[PDB]
A paper describes a structure:
The complex of Mitsuba-1 and NAcGal crystallised in space-group P21, and diffracted to 1.54 Å resolution. One complete monomer is found in the asymmetric unit, with no breaks in the the 2mFo-DFc electron density map of the chain, and there are no Ramachandran outliers. The structure is well ordered with each subdomain forming a β-sheet of four strands. The three-fold symmetry prevents internal residues of Mitsuba-1 from approaching the symmetry axis too closely, and a central cavity is found in the structure with a volume close to 100 Å3 according to KVFinder25. The HxDxH motif found at each binding site of MytiLec-1 is preserved, so that His 33, His 81 and His 129 of Mitsuba-1 form van der Waals contacts with the ligands but make no hydrogen bond with them.
In 2012, a lectin designated “MytiLec” was isolated from the Mediterranean mussel Mytilus galloprovincialis, and found to bind sugar chains with α-D-galactose at the reducing end1. The polypeptide chain has three well-conserved repeats of a roughly 50-residue sequence, and adopts a β-trefoil fold. MytiLec-1 is unusual among natural β-trefoil lectins in that each sequence repeat forms a sugar-binding site, so that each polypeptide binds three identical ligands, whereas, in general, β-trefoil lectins bind only one ligand per protein subunit.
Residue numbers in the entry: -1 to 143
């Protein structure tokens, strides 16, 4: 129930969400990407604000998941980045399909987190984006540490 530290795992590929470059201290607007590796710089915390909306926090840096530019309605294929700012456009909802695999939905726009290109096997360092489509390659699993 979303307390503690988690790996965010892409169902189709098994890859994880990382800051690009994997650093403990990425600057603002660093891209989020998928990558196979596991380490403490790919852990996240979920901060429950109530009523099923969450801030997604990078453990190592304390920065949050944003759409690049922070719009209420980002276009399809808008990059997800880390940023220290907080506001309504960096909130997310987790929708369970019913077996513990989730769509990760941007509250403001209703778009979902996808690997860019939607592959079942994104290459390492593929950017994560927002997109309106739903399919099995935009499901994620939250793996507690
Ligand atoms: C050696 C090392 O930490 N490598 C990291 C890797 O684990 C992953 O975090 C990646 C994400 O872009 O960034 C680097 O290549
Ligand atoms: C929209 C705005 O006024 N500021 C935001 C900032 O808060 C953050 O969301 C960032 C993410 O790239 O995009 C803009 O710079
Ligand atoms: C046709 C096809 O592959 N569509 C996908 C789409 O569903 C979405 O996953 C997107 C994310 O960048 O990548 C592709 O455009």
């Amino acid at each position: 129930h979303m307390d503690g530290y988690y790996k965010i795992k892409h169902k189709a590929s098994g890859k994880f969400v990382h800051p690009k470059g994997g650093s403990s201290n990425p600057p603002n607007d660093t891209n989020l990407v998928l990558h196979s590796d596991k380490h403490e710089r790919m852990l996240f915390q979920f901060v429950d604000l109530g009523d099923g909306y969450y801030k997604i926090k990078h453990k190592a840096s304390g920065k949050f998941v944003h759409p690049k530019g922070g719009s209420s309605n980002p276009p399809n294929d808008t990059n997800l980045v880390l940023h220290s700012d907080k506001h309504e456009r960096m909130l997310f909802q987790f929708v369970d399909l019913g077996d513990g695999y989730y769509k990760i939905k941007h509250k403001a726009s209703g778009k979902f987190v996808h690997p860019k290109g939607g592959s079942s096997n994104p290459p390492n360092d593929t950017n994560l984006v927002l997109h309106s489509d739903k399919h099995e390659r935009m499901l994620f699993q939250f793996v507690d540490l």
